[PDB]
Scaffold this active site. Structure first.
Site, short mmCIF file in Angstrom:
data_model
loop_
_atom_site.label_atom_id
_atom_site.label_comp_id
_atom_site.label_asym_id
_atom_site.label_seq_id
_atom_site.Cartn_x
_atom_site.Cartn_y
_atom_site.Cartn_z
N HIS B 44 0.80 -1.23 0.00
CA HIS B 44 0.00 0.00 0.00
C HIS B 44 0.85 1.31 0.00
O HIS B 44 0.36 2.38 -0.36
CB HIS B 44 -1.03 -0.02 1.16
CG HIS B 44 -0.50 0.48 2.47
ND1 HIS B 44 -0.20 -0.36 3.53
CD2 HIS B 44 -0.25 1.74 2.91
CE1 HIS B 44 0.20 0.36 4.56
NE2 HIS B 44 0.19 1.63 4.21
N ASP B 91 -0.14 -7.37 1.79
CA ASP B 91 0.43 -6.02 1.83
C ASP B 91 1.96 -6.07 1.93
O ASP B 91 2.56 -5.84 2.99
CB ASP B 91 -0.19 -5.25 3.00
CG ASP B 91 0.04 -3.77 2.89
OD1 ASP B 91 0.53 -3.31 1.83
OD2 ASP B 91 -0.28 -3.06 3.86
N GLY B 192 2.50 6.71 8.86
CA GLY B 192 3.88 7.14 8.66
C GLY B 192 4.90 6.04 8.95
O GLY B 192 6.06 6.15 8.54
N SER B 194 4.15 2.79 8.16
CA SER B 194 3.85 1.71 7.22
C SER B 194 5.05 1.30 6.37
O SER B 194 5.85 2.14 5.95
CB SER B 194 2.75 2.12 6.27
OG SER B 194 1.48 1.90 6.91
N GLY B 195 5.15 0.00 6.11
CA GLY B 195 6.23 -0.53 5.29
C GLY B 195 7.48 -0.80 6.10
O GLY B 195 8.34 -1.54 5.64
#
Ligand SMILES: *[C@@H]1O[C@H](CO[C@@H]2O[C@@H](C)[C@@H](O)[C@@H](O)[C@@H]2O)[C@@H](O[C@@H]2O[C@H](CO)[C@@H](O)[C@H](O)[C@H]2NC(C)=O)[C@H](O[C@@H]2O[C@@H](C)[C@@H](O)[C@@H](O)[C@@H]2O)[C@H]1NC(C)=O
Ligand SMILES: *[C@@H]1O[C@H](CO[C@@H]2O[C@@H](C)[C@@H](O)[C@@H](O)[C@@H]2O)[C@@H](O[C@@H]2O[C@H](CO)[C@@H](O)[C@H](O)[C@H]2NC(C)=O)[C@H](O[C@@H]2O[C@@H](C)[C@@H](O)[C@@H](O)[C@@H]2O)[C@H]1NC(C)=O
Ligand SMILES: *[C@@H]1O[C@H](CO)[C@@H](O)[C@H](O)[C@H]1NC(C)=O
Ligand SMILES: *[C@@H]1O[C@H](CO)[C@@H](O)[C@H](O)[C@H]1NC(C)=O
Lengths: 243, 243, 243, 243
Positions: B44, B91, B192, B194-195
């Protein structure tokens, strides 16, 4: 509503506005009157958590939002059990009003489609609401109810469109069978229109084909608006709403 | 990162910051160096549409965002094909750097777990990032990299937590096998982050257990943070990232 | 208006709304009908520069903003020549309408005070408008015209209040003779009310005592609302407005 | 700063940043070191009310804002007594540090001008700071200190400029004798730069001519930046700061 115009006062007698208590009774979604005492809307409108009913009200058709409010409390909220946080399937819910409303020319129910109606491309349909008139562009005061005619796009073609410019595998279905696609890059529903009705005139009768659910952007190229397909949930709706 | 502290300069040498060309190369997601030439992140983060690689850069371990930047270009982005809009499964994505990085003690890779590691409750794990320090509360300047220890919650226990206060049917699964839960109402990752990586100290070695993915709110009661479970996608990752 | 209630339809027939062309004719200041062809307002409302009149409209007494608008163009604007940027004295201006409005009981002029009227403490006065209902808190839809009774504070007492907790020397006058003070920490006018009327009932007759001008915050302790004192500028007004 | 460029690390050793406690020590204005223990700034920076000193800090010269902060507490704030709310004269204040700072080539004081220096048009001057780079356009991270050369406009010419396109009487003085004008539609100071220094090179020596105070817009046609004229307040400054 993107690319539409203000609705004539005699059109869409079933349109309703959902209000949440926040300094004033603020509109957050639309809905439709499908029975004198029931409103159809999107599950995501009344999520992500079970809501305190004291914080919500329903407003029957108004040419201009907030101006002549006669807010109605809700008796019960029924959200499709297959619906869950961050996903778009089964995006449908019912609101049972505390009281049955008076039916008239100006305010009355919309007919649900028979199970056999597929609403194919070419069908004349309109989506209505008080939502944004463009991406991140809210409807300006005095907030007239808007309408726009949107073209129906066959599910398989729509699913292919959603794969254009995306990383998703061709064999991974984005648009499901409980969904319906409508709109183009000039005409669409948008934020603020969720839960409202997509209605099509079939042989002189207005039938509710969909419930505004989601989309990538609003009126974005290759991204038609996605609606919950009402025919798919008729048995569920019928468990609660009487003939 | 909610409830943590600024990270020591010697910790998390694999942490990366993904940047998008704005009025400056602004941070939008985290990632982890899993190979001298490969970054692991969330699908995402590089969504919803296929990206123009010229608008993206990777920043390797730095104590403060924007200060001593040395931005690196990306030659390739690979997003798991099962991933699609407004859904949380699969994801995960890979970014191939244009050049392999020089590995040192200050900047090096994180070890992926063996397929058999389940990361059960009680395991000491930390999540790191430059994300919000509370709901709608961005990390303030000088933007130090933060860390927080987060408690793991077993998947089914976590699935039940997400049904608390929700309209979803008890038989409808919210938390899936390709997910992992960690965090509580005091410590969690946030927008912020994420990933970025969730790493656990397993019998002397740091292993990347998850990739920050989603959650209801940040550090919200009964809503643990949800991560993409790395072991679930080892075969997909090894199809691109060398041994 | 802070601390008041919605005004009855029969009250304040002289109230007007000044509009600026945005995505709609948005309200930005109030004013008062002091002659069938003249509106009295604050100079800062039509500042900082000489305006393009095509971007401004006048709306006469209406119960709710934007609903039943009948916008009127402005023939010319006359701002008191002593007025200049970032200074608050001489905050007064006149707007001449293209033609006179039809005078009725629902829309008519307000009487100006005789030069000798000082409006001392204890006088029953009301300020009206569609401005903020608290600091940084706009009037919610449907934008009803609001009213609030505000207590007058003698000028020197008021000048002393403004020195409380301020670095200004005691011999430096903050509140001047062309100003009038009214309001307390419960009732006051606010942003969005500027240019509107402060009217007092004097021996059975409503007289406009002031024009909403400025203040530190709204209903802030020891900071009463400051109004341009109408009697101070009667000669300037009568230089344009017939008797 | 509008226009200009990031400052060489060797320039403006007297520049300081004023910080207020708000989630982080946030920059709100500039200042200049005019004595090892005193900072010169604008009165409006430390208004409108007498401030709790615990909420303020001073940061000496740093190339990038927030990155290598070494915050200094303030012992006393002295605001010119002629200064008051919503008016621009006497916009000057002094901050006495708890301790004298170490003086070096990279951090040292700027010399004040002799009372006879009028800084006439043609003098080479620069204004420096971390403020907006355009109207409502903040300086992006990593927040470099900026500088821009601005042309001096003689006071009367400037006053006449501020009358162009304004309602103010030609004989009503907008720009006063305790003010100085500098800048054009391409070079100027802006919001965030207030309290900082305007310095001019005179016979090879830098002298502080002005304190960033106000202006209509930033780099707006016919609206030069307006500065507090330091020479006008030398006696007042000398009452507190040792020669
Ligand atoms: C439901 O409709 C009732 C009948 O309304 C009248 O006839 C309709 C066909 C339509 O022409 C409508 O415009 C008419 O007013 C309402 O009752 C009437 O209410 C009005 C006042 O609004 C009153 O003057 C009438 O005497 C009254 N007639 C009847 C049959 O009682 C209902 O209003 C509610 O009930 C009223 C008695 C009163 O308590 C009112 O405050 C209530 O709202 C309508 N119900 C609703 C939910 O609006
Ligand atoms: C004021 O400056 C003192 C001397 O600084 C050194 O010499 C300069 C010429 C330059 O080369 C500079 O880089 C040097 O650091 C400071 O004292 C020195 O502080 C350092 C640690 O910061 C220490 O290692 C030195 O031994 C010490 N020398 C002296 C002469 O004391 C001042 O620092 C403060 O006082 C120190 C004693 C220590 O408590 C430190 O924490 C303090 O910051 C400088 N004062 C300030 C307020 O910055
Ligand atoms: C519409 O009416 C025509 C004529 O009665 C009929 O043949 C057709 O099948 C109808 N379509 C639908 C959807 O009912
Ligand atoms: C600058 O130097 C010249 C030559 O010495 C002198 O005539 C002039 O007045 C000086 N200006 C100032 C401000 O000292």
């Amino acid at each position: 509503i993107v690319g539409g115009q203000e609705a004539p006062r005699s059109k869409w007698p079933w349109q309703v506005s959902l209000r949440v208590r926040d300094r004033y009774w603020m509109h957050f979604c639309g809905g439709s009157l499908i029975h004198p005492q029931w409103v159809l809307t999107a599950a995501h409108c009344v999520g992500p958590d079970v809501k305190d009913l004291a914080t919500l009200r329903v407003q029957l058709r108004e040419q201009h939002l907030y101006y002549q409010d006669q807010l109605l409390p809700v008796s019960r909220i029924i959200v499709h059990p297959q619906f869950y946080i961050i996903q778009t399937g089964a995006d449908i819910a019912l609101l049972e009003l505390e009281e049955p409303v008076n039916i008239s020319s100006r305010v009355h129910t919309v007919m649900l489609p028979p199970a056999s109606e597929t609403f194919p491309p070419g069908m004349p349909c309109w989506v209505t609401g008080w939502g944004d008139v463009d991406n991140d562009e809210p409807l300006p005061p005095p907030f007239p109810l808007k309408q726009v005619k949107v073209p129906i796009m066959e599910n398989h073609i729509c699913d292919a469109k959603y794969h254009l410019g995306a990383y998703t595998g061709d064999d991974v279905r984005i648009i499901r069978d409980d969904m319906l696609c409508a709109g183009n890059s000039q005409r669409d529903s948008c934020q603020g229109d969720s839960g409202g009705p997509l209605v099509c005139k079939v042989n002189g009768t207005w039938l509710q084909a969909g419930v505004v659910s989601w989309g990538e952007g609003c009126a974005q190229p290759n991204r038609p608006g996605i609606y919950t397909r009402v025919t798919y949930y008729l048995d569920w709706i019928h468990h609660y709403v009487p003939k």
